[PDB]
Amino acid sequence: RNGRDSEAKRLGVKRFGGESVLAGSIIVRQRGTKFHAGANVGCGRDHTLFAKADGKVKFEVKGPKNRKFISIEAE
Amino acid sequence: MKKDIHPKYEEITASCSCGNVMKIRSTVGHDLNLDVCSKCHPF
Amino acid sequence: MLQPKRTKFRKMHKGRNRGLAQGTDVSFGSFGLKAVGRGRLTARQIEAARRAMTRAVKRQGKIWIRVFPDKPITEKPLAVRMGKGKGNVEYWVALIQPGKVLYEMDGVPEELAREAFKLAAAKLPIKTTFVTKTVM
Amino acid sequence: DKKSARIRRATRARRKLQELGATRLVVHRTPRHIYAQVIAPNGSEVLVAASTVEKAIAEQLKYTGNKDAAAAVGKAVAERALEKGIKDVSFDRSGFQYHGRVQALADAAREAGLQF
Amino acid sequence: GIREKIKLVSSAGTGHFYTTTKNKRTKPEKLELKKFDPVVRQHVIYKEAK
Amino acid sequence: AKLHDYYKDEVVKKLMTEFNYNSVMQVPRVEKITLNMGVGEAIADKKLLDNAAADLAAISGQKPLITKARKSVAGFKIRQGYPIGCKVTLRGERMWEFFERLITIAVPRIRDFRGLSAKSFDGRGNYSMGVREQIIFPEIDYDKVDRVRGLDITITTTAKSDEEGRALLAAFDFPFR
RNA sequence: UGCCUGGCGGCCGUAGCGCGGUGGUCCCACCUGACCCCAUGCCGAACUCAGAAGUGAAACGCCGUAGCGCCGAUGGUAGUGUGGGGUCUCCCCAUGCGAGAGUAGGGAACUGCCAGGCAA
RNA sequence: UCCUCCUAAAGAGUAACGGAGGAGCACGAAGGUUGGCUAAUCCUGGUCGGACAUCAGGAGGUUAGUGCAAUGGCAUAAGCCAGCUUGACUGCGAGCGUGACGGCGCGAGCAGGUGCGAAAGCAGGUCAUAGUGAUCCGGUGGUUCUGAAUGGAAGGGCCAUC
RNA sequence: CGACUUACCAACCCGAUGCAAACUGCGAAUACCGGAGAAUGUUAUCACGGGAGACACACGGCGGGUGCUAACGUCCGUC
């Protein structure tokens, strides 16, 4: 009675650390918030992370819970 | 202390049979008559 | 007939038996039977070997079983075409890698221990050897 | 714990101001000596501070830790900030209800030039 | 799908309307939301209707 | 309030001498009292909750609040968020007068009295007890009520253990039979 | 410049827990009252206002202690890219990368800005 | 047909009559904002009350909860309570993700007019991921856009919707 | 109403030993994305236009599902 499946949602990181992006570009597609928005990064209703400014994207770990953050520096 | 939601807490004097009289604020009403108290009792 | 209770899933993938054994040392008794070959032992084989030693030692000492099946195996019924879903679970097997200690034992002389293990190994499908508890 | 509850209360506001990147006026209140501070967006340096703990401001008001004290400190931060140059700031409750002394300090500050 | 669709008609003379859904079994009374009417470019009261 | 002055007059000294503490605040002191009434039969007739709350307002000096079930359990046929009891917590000054009424007019009027228990301690310094009937308190006339349900009392203090809590209560001439 | 104290950060368990000691000149906390401001799905509990008597008990800060958590080598082992070999449902050789766990050990923090008291 | 996990070989994708489960909704609030709050499970004392109702204290730190299966996420809570509300708004939309295509998804910002807050600010539905059906034909309301000699009308077009 | 023993059943925990595609307090090698640089390659790259064919694949190595770790079996990934 098996045989059912769902179409893959093509999640994952779209832009990796150290590459320039344009404002509004999608950086990470995720179900929850595995990565939290940092500086110049906005979070969508579906927890999508997009660039709010033009620059280089970088990843880092911050906070007491060592949770991962994505930031953008104007470079 | 909320208003017009609590019962009246007026003072009232109560005395028991063994001659002990004390003033207490409560909701007993108008008058009270007692026979025993903390003392004068076979506790 | 060792078997788990209320396992999470009825069926599981075949997998592979690559790798190397972890429980390679005697931990409970003073003597043990180490696995030299690679393969899988069914629940029936484990029971048969256990009965052989208990009779050999005449219920003297202690017996430790260091392997549990915890892996269902299916088998299609005779005269059944391929497909139409996974087969029904039939028996449970334990994957054995070289160096795995199968049974442990204590409370008997070394001489009597050797024959007891030899009888058990005669009813197993994998090459085995006799080992003794090491000091550290 | 009073402190733990207060920090938990103000964490969301502090994070919101931090990511917004704007100078924030932070006020700390106690049974005596209400404090006030101005913090740069990075959060690493203090532009200017005032309070009733120093004799320069504690030599006039009868008692420190009342509405009058809050107005004095709220006013005191004003001309200091105006003299420094910074005009716009973001008020931070720091977990203190914006009702009494905190409100009085903010009201004195906003009417004294630090509109927010 | 017991929930059924309704029409919200602006209180102004304009014919603009919104469309939504509601459950008549639980909340049988009318709906009086205050929404934006672009024909008059003002926020007005919208009444439920068919 | 009278006993509060009595407590502040020499009881603190009595606590001071017996435990010879370093400071004055080290002595245990009561901070609040709590009244509980786990009626339980709200399901059979929820209408009785209001009057069950009413009498607690007679004993207490304020309006009770109705407590709701923490969770639903099939063994009691109770769903989450369903009121199944009421409680009252009183502190400040009003607790003192109620403490008078309990220690002077209530305990003596216990039907088939035998003595207040002394082993009713939670292990940290808090005292709890229960009563059979309401008529112990003077605020019941025996004709306006027709129920046998009781209530529970609990007094909590700043004691770090039972020994000082028992000693502090003994200073309040508790029976402790 | 130093012992301290409060606030805002950096950094985030070598930074966190447990046990013992230590602090009231200021600051901090507890604490008195609350008619008024404010609040309790009841309570000055919590929040808020008017105060400073008393206190360092609790909490908080600092010191000591490894009793835990935590960090952690070197070596070896497992795995593995590429090219070969075997008694090929698994392994070995040459070369490159190289864990996890464990062991020796480390460890009971460091640091920037502002404000206040004492000694300087 | 759609959703979640595994198979799937640490980017994405990836088959089988392979192994497990769900959906064809719900909600004018379960939405927006402001303010406040922080579980499960155990130990001790206490009337009915009893292992399991409610009260008090202690260990615990999220094993709780999150309208619905699963995965990911959630203390700044996305979890729980209350006040005021309709941003579940209109016209757009830089720039991206995803598809052979039809299409689907995210979105700063601008104009108009609103709600909450002292304010910075948040709000273009709901913690996210299922709750859905192209085109044709026809119905309803608005709009002189058109309206085959002219003025109208019928019928079409455009917009909203069935 | 105090209270006690046990040749006997046993929860939760502690010490040691294992197992897991649908467990992860850890975590590679490769692969993939982006940037800089030299050499090399008949622009090997991308965009647009004209014309196609093909959409029955097979075996071998490696990682797997299925089958009996059977099949010159069957179904995927990569060469």
Cα F116 to the chain's mean position, in Å?
13
Method of determination used here: cryo-EM
- SS3 string, chain D, reads CHHHHHHHHHHHHHHHHHHHCCCEEEEECCCCCCEEEEECCCCCCEEEEEECCCHHHHCCCCCCCCHHHHHHHHHHHHHHHHHHCCCCCEEECCCCCCCCHHHHHHHHHHHCCCCC
Chain I nucleotides near the protein (CB, 7 A): 16-23, 33-35, 63-71, 73-74
Q: What is the CATH number of the domain that holds F157?
A: 3.30.1440.10
- Please give the tally of structural domains in chain F: 1
- Give the type of residue at D14: R
Q: How many residues make up chain A in this entry?
A: 75
Other beta carbons within 10 Å of C132: 11
CA angle D68, D73, D75 (to 5 degrees): 90
CB contact B28 to F (< 8 Å): yes
Contact list, B5 vs chain F (CB under 8 Å) = 63
Query: Distance, in angstroms, between B17 CA and closest chain F CA?
Result: 12
Q: Show the 3-state SS of F52-100.
A: HHHHHHHHCCCCCEEEECCCCEHHHCECCCCEEEEEEEEECCHHHHHHH
Give the resolution to one decimal, in Å. Answer: 2.4
d(CA C130, CA C121): 10
- Taken as a whole, chain D contains a residue count of 116
CB contacts of F175 in chain B (<8 Å) are 43
Strand I at less than 7 A from CB of C90: no
Q: Contact, D38 vs D104, CB < 8 A? A: no
CA C18 to CA A67: how far, in whole Å? 36
Cα–Cα distance, D31 to D36 (Å, whole number)? 14
The whole domain housing F27 covers 1-177
- Three-state DSSP at F35 gives strand
Tell me how many domains chain E contains.
Answer: 1
Ordered domains of chain C (ranges, CATH): 21-136 (3.90.1170.10)
Which secondary-structure segment (H or E) carries F156?
A: strand F151-157
Annotated binding site of B for Zn(2+): 16
Flag if B2 and F63 touch (Cβ within 8 Å). yes
Please count the structural domains in chain D.
Answer: 1
Q: Residue F116 has which token pair?
A: 């207040």
The structure tokens listed for F136 are 């112990």
Please spell the DSSP secondary structure of B24-37, one letter per residue: EESS--S--B-S--
What is the Cβ-side half-sphere exposure of residue D23, based on CA atoms within 13 angstroms?
18
Residue C4 forms beta bridges with which residues?
none
> CB contact, 8 Å: F58 with chain B?
yes
Q: Distance between CA atoms of B31 and D28, rounded to whole angstroms?
A: 54
Nearest CA in chain F to B28: F139
B14 interfacial to chain F (CB closer than 8 Å): yes
* Nearest CA-CA partner of F6 in F89, F99, F91, F90: F99
Whether B17 and chain F come into contact, CB under 8 Å, resolves to no
Q: Can you tell me the distance from the alpha carbon of C97 to that of C100, in angstroms, rounded to the nearest whole number?
A: 6
Q: Are strands A35-37 and A67-73 parallel, antiparallel or unpaired?
A: parallel
Q: Give me the domain span that covers residue D64.
A: 1-116
Separation between Cα atoms, residue D27 and residue D100, nearest integer Å: 13
Residue with tokens 């058990």: C120
CB contact at 8 A, D58 and D83: no
CB-CB neighbors (< 8 A) of B34 in chain F? 105, 138
Within chain F, where are the H helices?
2-6, 12-19, 48-59, 94-101, 162-171
Domain enclosing residue E38, as ranges: 1-50
Residue pair A26/A50 in contact (Cβ under 8 Å)? The answer is: yes
**Structural tokens at position C39:** 């393969």
Q: How far is CA E49 from CA E18, E20, E37, in A?
A: 10, 11, 16
